């Protein structure tokens, strides 16, 4: 039983990271091509060490060290996939017939979620049968998302060369940050105070924040700030393909490695599974070698 949850979590993490290879036609991080090559090289070293840790600790029944090696492999495999997916995008967009497009100022999905979370927290802290503890827990949700919104505003301000947009992203973030401080002040103010006037008073302090959040959502929704997707030409997709296939093969074999290790950890008396394990481990290594060679040969 012990060790199996680590393996199950790793297999779930692999299933998630594999979506990055389905249509890698947009950037997924800020890594340069050499950033990608550096990350692939470092993770190759880490994974090599982890694959040896997985086999040796399953063999010897060191189940805490086995679990750490499974977790370490998983993290290195996810890093590899992120680097491979970014590298593929950069290869595709570098083709002469590709159109690179532009980065949007604010990632829209997490932006909308942050605004909704603040709005829902403000509504929750205002519900009539809500306990004082729920007021405080709602405040922590507001603080979390207020910090994320401010960071994203500072980034958006950095990304734009338009002085008016530069200034407005900061001012809008400032309005959100100061309204949260006033709301937190009023929550902190509540001490042994659980009366209808303070319930109404907390509700009252949500208004400037909800308005500031709405004003920022309206400002940030200007189509001028939106991403314009890259267009990858057929030849760019052909150029990316060896990187994508090698990364997909690494993950397929890594998944088999982890499934095999999960069984061997419980029962290491299994000569067939030991060969399968060595086969998956060598195919993982072969795929990484092919991916690095492909990243160098197909380099823009």
């Amino acid at each position: 039983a012990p060790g199996q949850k680590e393996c199950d979590n790793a297999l779930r993490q692999l299933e998630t990271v594999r979506e990055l290879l389905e249509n890698p036609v947009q950037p997924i991080n800020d890594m340069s091509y050499f950033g990608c090559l550096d990350s692939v090289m470092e993770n190759s070293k880490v994974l090599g060490e982890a694959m040896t840790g997985i086999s040796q600790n399953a063999k010897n029944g060191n189940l805490p060290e086995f679990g750490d090696a499974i977790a370490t492999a998983s993290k290195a495999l996810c890093g590899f996939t992120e680097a491979a997916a970014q590298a593929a995008y950069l290869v595709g967009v570098s083709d002469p017939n590709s159109q690179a497009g532009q980065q949007g100022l604010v990632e829209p999905t997490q932006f909308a979620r942050a605004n909704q979370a603040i709005q829902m927290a403000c509504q929750s802290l205002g519900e009539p049968g809500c306990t004082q503890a729920q007021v405080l827990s709602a405040a922590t949700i507001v603080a979390k998302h207020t910090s994320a919104l401010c960071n994203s505003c500072r980034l958006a301000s950095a990304r734009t060369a338009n002085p008016t947009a530069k200034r407005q992203f900061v001012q809008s973030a400032k309005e959100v940050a100061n309204s949260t401080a006033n709301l937190v002040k009023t929550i902190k103010a509540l001490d042994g105070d659980f009366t209808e006037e303070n319930r109404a008073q907390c509700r009252a302090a949500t208004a400037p924040l909800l308005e500031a959040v709405d004003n920022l959502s309206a400002f940030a929704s200007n189509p001028e700030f939106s991403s314009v997707p890259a267009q990858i030409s057929p030849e760019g997709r052909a150029a990316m393909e060896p990187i994508v296939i090698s990364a997909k093969t690494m993950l397929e074999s890594a998944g088999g490695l982890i499934q095999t290790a999960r069984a061997l950890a419980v029962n290491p008396r299994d000569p067939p599974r030991w060969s399968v394990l060595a086969g998956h481990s060598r195919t993982v290594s072969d795929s990484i070698k092919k991916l690095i060679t492909s990243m160098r040969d197909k380099a823009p």
Partner: peptide, 19 residues
């Protein structure tokens, strides 16, 4: 602590207030 907690949550908020 009630102040330490909200400080941990508010992240790098000061970079905006000072700005």
């Amino acid at each position: 602590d009630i102040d330490q907690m909200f400080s941990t949550l508010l992240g790098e908020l000061d970079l905006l207030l000072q700005s």
